[PDB]
Design a protein around this ligand. Structure first.
Ligand SMILES: [Mg+2]
Length: 534
């Protein structure tokens, strides 16, 4: 019974209830339909140049209203992919690369040859093209293992954007400054959409009023929906009262909602988000139980209870674990009921199997701690990957998705490279971040520890190696998105977002879920409190 420590929730009952004025909602919806159809006609414009078509698509995407034009934007990029017209200018070429690649079109990086000398490096003469540099920088983060051409693209555009930025006009200066701390591709969609609309496009002189208006309204309307869901989930979490009954666990439902919200923000994924938040919260309790409270013997009985997954096993568990255990089983029972109507209740097991896997490994992590076992990196990862809970959350995100078939879950059960990459990113990033705290304590059992021992290298060199694993992972994720995809892209995005969440949460190399204050707090306010002033 180790000392408390964990900071209490900052929010309180701030989101406990949200009465949505259907008056303001309908008006917003009414005008959005108009602006929507008006934006549609913009995309279907015939005599439009390449650069214009790309800038238009990029903007609608950054404004976060592109989910209205899945088909439209696709048929247009498809054509652009098949016509292969050379734009000759860096700005447009880089953007054509990124947008196509992000949509799975395997466009060749040969397009970037004309901007490199006979040596293969970028012409230093482009150092004055700010828009060209910015779009390249963005594009360098979508490269795969086959794109060795873009090898130096990131370092190139970076050093020169940092040099040029201080004298740029606004909002361009701000856009560049923000891109340097957060590229678009590895950032959370609503978070970047919130930043684009309010900090950039609104302050853009050449802004398209129909698009900005559309953007602000749509964003604000969806925020109402998110506020509702969070309310609903906040009430659910109070009825469990784990804040009083389990004072050792972290109270972070708003933070858990944020993740669910970064996995998907569309209204159609409302049922999905709710299920997902509940599970991220629940598994958070379990992580806290193994990590800071439970004892050797108790954890063992807990892991067995989870594997059996009955209810009779509850008696073998101490009183405090009986609450956790039952909560978990009742949660899945609700899921089974929620899906009963569509007849999709039979998929819930897939998530349960992953949870057992998560717990088994949690337990092993514990055993290693007690023995003081420092396994070789390979052995460490074979266990430390599932403890990230990403195979688990990844499977959970499919529950609430009405389109998810049994086949989609089977594909996911084989541990796809795309899923594997996402899990590794969380793993290495988390270990890099949480190293000193665990070792200043002592923990010869941590990720960086096994790495330094296994390879006989310094701490600096070990974290450096972990960074490359994350870079490798990202490249695998990008490759993963390329067509033909194993499953509908609709099922690849959740995984992609889970990795975006890691990048956003551990950006200052600090645990964002445990220490929200300086990392996650602003985002939550920007997405779930403050609306965009119309
Ligand atoms: Mg643990």
């Amino acid at each position: 019974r180790p000392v408390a420590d964990f900071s209490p929730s900052l929010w309180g009952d701030q989101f406990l209830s949200f009465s949505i004025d259907n008056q303001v909602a309908e008006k917003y919806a009414k005008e959005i339909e108009a602006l929507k159809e008006q934006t549609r006609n913009m995309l279907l414009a015939t005599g439009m140049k390449l650069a214009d078509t790309l800038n238009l698509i990029d903007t609608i995407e950054r404004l976060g209203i592109s989910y209205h034009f899945e088909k439209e934007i696709d048929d247009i990029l498809d054509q652009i992919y098949n016509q292969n017209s050379n734009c000759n200018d860096l700005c447009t070429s880089a953007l054509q690369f990124r947008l196509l690649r992000q949509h799975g079109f395997n466009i060749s990086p040969e397009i970037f040859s004309k901007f490199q000398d006979e040596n293969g490096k970028f012409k230093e003469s482009l150092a004055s093209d700010v828009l060209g540099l910015l779009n390249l920088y963005e594009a360098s983060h979508v490269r795969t293992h086959a794109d060795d051409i873009l090898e130096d693209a990131l370092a190139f555009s970076t050093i020169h954007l940092e040099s040029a930025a201080p004298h740029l006009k606004s909002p361009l200066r701000e856009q560049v400054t923000h891109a340097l701390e957060q590229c678009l591709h590895k950032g959370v969609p609503r978070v970047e959409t919130r930043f684009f609309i309010s900090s950039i496009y609104d302050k853009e002189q050449s802004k398209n009023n129909v698009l900005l208006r559309f953007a602000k309204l749509d964003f604000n309307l969806l925020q109402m929906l998110h506020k509702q869901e969070l309310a609903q989930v906040s009430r659910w979490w109070k009825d469990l009262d784990f804040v009083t009954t389990l004072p050792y666990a972290r109270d972070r439902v708003v933070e858990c909602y944020f993740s669910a919200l970064g996995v998907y923000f569309e209204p159609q994924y409302s049922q999905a988000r709710v299920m997902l938040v509940k599970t991220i919260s629940m598994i958070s309790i379990v992580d806290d139980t193994f990590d800071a409270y439970g004892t050797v013997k108790e954890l063992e009985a807990y892991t067995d209870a989870i594997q059996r997954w009955d209810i009779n096993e509850i008696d073998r568990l101490p009183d405090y674990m009986k609450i956790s255990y039952k909560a978990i089983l009742d949660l899945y029972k609700d899921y089974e009921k929620e899906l009963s109507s569509a007849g999709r209740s039979h998929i819930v097991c897939h998530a349960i199997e992953r949870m057992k896997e998560v717990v088994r490994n949690y337990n092993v992590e514990s055993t290693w701690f007690i023995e003081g076992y420092t396994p070789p990196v390979s052995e460490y990862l074979s266990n430390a990957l599932a403890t990230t809970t990403y195979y688990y959350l990844a499977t959970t995100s499919y529950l609430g998705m009405k389109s998810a078939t049994e086949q989609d879950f089977e594909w996911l059960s084989k541990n796809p490279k795309i899923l594997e990459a996402s899990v590794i990113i969380w793993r290495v990033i988390d270990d890099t971040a949480t190293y000193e705290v665990e070792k200043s304590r002592g923990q010869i059992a941590t990720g960086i520890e096994c790495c330094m021992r296994d390879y006989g290298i310094s701490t600096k060199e070990a974290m450096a190696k972990f960074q490359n694993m994350a870079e490798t992972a990202w490249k695998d994720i990008n490759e993963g998105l390329l067509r033909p995809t194993p499953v509908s892209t609709e099922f690849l995005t959740p995984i992609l977002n889970l990795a975006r969440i890691v990048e956003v949460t551990y950006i200052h190399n600090l645990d964002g879920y445990t220490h929200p204050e300086e990392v996650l707090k602003p985002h939550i306010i920007n997405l779930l409190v403050d609306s965009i002033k119309i």
